[PDB]
Amino acid sequence: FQGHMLFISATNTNAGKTTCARLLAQYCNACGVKTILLKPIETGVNDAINHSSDAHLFLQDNRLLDRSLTLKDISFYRYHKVSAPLIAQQEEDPNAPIDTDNLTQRLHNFTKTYDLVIVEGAGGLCVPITLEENMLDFALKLKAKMLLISHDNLGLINDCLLNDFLLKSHQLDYKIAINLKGNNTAFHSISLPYIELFNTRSNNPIVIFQQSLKVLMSFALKGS
Amino acid sequence: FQGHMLFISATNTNAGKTTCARLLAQYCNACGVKTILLKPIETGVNDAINHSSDAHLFLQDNRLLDRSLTLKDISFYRYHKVSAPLIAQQEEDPNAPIDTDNLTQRLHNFTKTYDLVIVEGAGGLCVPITLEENMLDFALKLKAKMLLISHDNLGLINDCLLNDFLLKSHQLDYKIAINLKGNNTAFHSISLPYIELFNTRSNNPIVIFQQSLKVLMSFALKGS
Ligand SMILES: Nc1ncnc2c1ncn2[C@@H]1O[C@H](COP(=O)(O)OP(=O)(O)OP(=O)(O)O)[C@@H](O)[C@H]1O
Ligand SMILES: Nc1ncnc2c1ncn2[C@@H]1O[C@H](COP(=O)(O)OP(=O)(O)OP(=O)(O)O)[C@@H](O)[C@H]1O
Ligand SMILES: [Mg+2]
Ligand SMILES: [Mg+2]
């Protein structure tokens, strides 16, 4: 086939999409699986003054494979407002609604030249991009597999389970992974006991990202 | 009929269930609608040393209507662990799983003596109480109407919409209300524009709790 595509969403902004995407692409590249990182839609940015956005971080990693890449090759709709993409678009670029057909073509074109195309979303599964589409709708149009990153604090059970319910209600292959930060052992005492129970009872277990690089590479690449 | 029952859940722990429950019961009581506040399951508590739990706050309000009430009349399963109720029960009281049939009877008994019975949950809709039941399952067994309180920060769109999807997938009457705190005007600039759009497109709008005491009293009391 052409390259596989993995969408990375999250329980919440700041949960760890970019951290975990970069760690997974680094692992895949070190294993010989040629992997690009894309951030098609990004809010909260000011490219004139700041070179630290998700797309900038992705670009640095990506240029290890292709020096010719530039920011506009990997990120397409960019906004100053710290908001849902739909509202940032309506306010800053009223005449250019986000075109997910166009995004789908652009992203799929990278499956010619990479074994894996990782696509970071923004906001959350239900965050609106157009009047008719949210991030999940975008992921569904892409026909990507889904990696949902969860935070590692109290509340992760509820947040993971809300996302599980939405995702299992749709036709896509997905995996929920907790981004377990350094210095957190409350997790193991408070939340992990339920994750373990849930996993005995579920055909699609919740994993810990840091434990799961090999499993998540396998997941991303499996099948058609 | 007997008294109505309203379950209060939230997008997240600390979103404002207890604050909003107390404000709604105060309003209802001031309108002549005799209203009790119940906290059937509570984690994170130490009653030997602290008289500030949700059940204690509810009890103070409730004793304005019935001096004879005590803590054990309005809260039934109480745990020290700051966790999901299921894990706190398994660790602290292994031989007493939470009995939602029993809770249902206890809570329904208050519909003899009150016009409205407000029931605060814990944790979130998907938080586990028994091996087979979460908070939503409990609310469904109660045949209560549902008030879901959302936080007022960035992320509320995603969180409200995840809960909306779960709730609309079940057979219950529900209302999502944002607990808009004092000193937050970022809300109006960042999140409200989408809430307004959503509400033009939805048959069940997301409201702002502070704007909605009368509407939410009407909601709680309407019909059978
Ligand atoms: N495992 C981790 N260990 C330490 N720091 C982390 C970890 N994961 C995330 N962080 C830090 O938390 C912050 C948020 O992480 P990150 O940018 O990966 O999240 P995000 O989900 O991509 O956010 P956004 O929604 O803005 O795209 C960053 O400063 C990051 O360095
Ligand atoms: N509208 C508000 N204005 C000011 N403070 C608020 C507001 N709502 C909540 N708070 C404060 O935020 C904290 C959490 O609120 P509250 O206890 O109502 O949340 P909760 O959802 O009931 O939490 P829990 O999940 O622990 O039951 C409390 O200290 C409360 O006083
Ligand atoms: Mg990011
Ligand atoms: Mg409370």
SS (H, E, C) chain A: CCCEEEEEEECCCCCCHHHHHHHHHHHHHHCCCCEEEECCEECCCCCCCCCCCHHHHHHHHHCCCCCCCCHHHHCCEECCCCCCHHHHHHHHCCCCCCCHHHHHHHHHHHHHCCCEEEEECCCCCCCECCCCCEHHHHHHHHCCEEEEEECCCCCHHHHHHHHHHHHHCCCCCEEEEECCCCCCCHHHHHCHHHHHHHHHHCCCCCEEHHHCHHHHHHHHHCCC
As a whole number of angstroms, the distance between CA A167 and CA A158 comes to: 14
Q: Confirm if B140 and B167 have CB atoms less than 8 A apart.
A: no
CB A40 within 8 A of CB A5: no
**Cα end-to-end distance, chain A, whole Å:** 7
Q: After which residues is chain B broken (C to N over 2.5 A)?
A: none
CA distance B112 to chain A (A): 33
Residue nearest to atom 11 of ligand 2 (CA): B16
Per-residue buried b or exposed e for B56-67, using 16+ beta carbons within 10 Å of the residue's own CB = bbbbebbeeeee
Active site residues of A: 39
Cβ pair A193:B90 closer than 8 A: yes
Two tokens, residue B97: 């799983």
Cα A92 to averaged position of ligand 3 atoms, centre (Å): 21
Which residues are A10's β-sheet partners? Answer: A149
Q: B39 in ligand 2 pocket by Cβ < 6 Å?
A: no
Cα separations (Å) of B157 from A20, A132, B95, B165? 24, 15, 40, 12
Asked how this structure was determined, the answer is X-ray
Say whether residue B121 is in contact with chain A using an 8 A CB cutoff: no
How far does the CA of residue A127 sit from the closest CA of chain B (Å)?
Answer: 5
Look at residues A68, A72, A6 and name the one whose alpha carbon lies nearest to residue A33. Answer: A6
d(C-alpha A41, C-alpha A30), whole Å: 27
SS3 letters for chain B? Answer: CCCEEEEEEECCCCCCHHHHHHHHHHHHHHCCCCEEEECCEECCCCCCCCCCCHHHHHHHHHCCCCCCCCHHHHCCEECCCCCCHHHHHHHHCCCCCCCHHHHHHHHHHHHHCCCEEEEECCCCCCCECCCCCEHHHHHHHHCCEEEEEECCCCCHHHHHHHHHHHHHCCCCCEEEEECCCCCCCHHHHHCHHHHHHHHHHCCCCCEEHHHCHHHHHHHHHCCC
Sheet with B4-10: list strands edge to edge: B35-38, B116-120, B4-10, B145-150, B174-178, B207-208
Q: Which atom of ligand 1 is nearest to the CA of A13?
A: 25
Would you call B123 and A158 a contact, using CB atoms and an 8 Å cutoff? yes
- Interface touch A81/B190, C-beta < 8 Å: yes
* 8 A C-beta contact, residue A95 and residue A137: no
CB B15 within 8 A of CB B209: no
Rounded Cα gap, residues A17 and A14, in angstroms: 7
- Whether A125 and A134 have beta carbons less than 8 Å apart is answered as yes
B107 closest CA partner among B6, B185, B215:
B6
Q: B119 — phi, psi (to 5°)?
A: -120, 110
CA distances from B109 to A89, B102, B103, B116, B147 (A): 52, 11, 10, 12, 21
Nearest to B178 by CA among B210, B217, B202: B210
Strand B41-42 to strand B77-78: parallel, antiparallel, or no bridges (unpaired)?
parallel
CB A175 within 8 A of CB A202: no
Cβ-contact A44, A10 below 8 angstroms: no
**CA B197 from centroid of its chain's CA atoms:** 26
Residue B10 β-bridge partners: B149
Name the residue type at position B92: E
B125/A158 touch (CB, cutoff 8 Å), yes or no: yes
* Topology of the domain covering B1-224: Rossmann fold (3.40.50)
Cβ neighbours of residue B40 closer than 8 Å, sequence gap 6 or more? B75, B76, B77, B103, B106, B107, B119
The residue assigned the tokens 């008030």 is: B147
Is A166 in CB contact (< 8 Å) with chain B? Answer: yes
B177, B179, B185, B190: CA torsion to nearest 10: -50
Q: How far is CA A192 from CA A147, A156, A216, B41, in A?
A: 19, 10, 19, 21
| Residue A110 to chain B, least CA–CA distance (Å) | 29
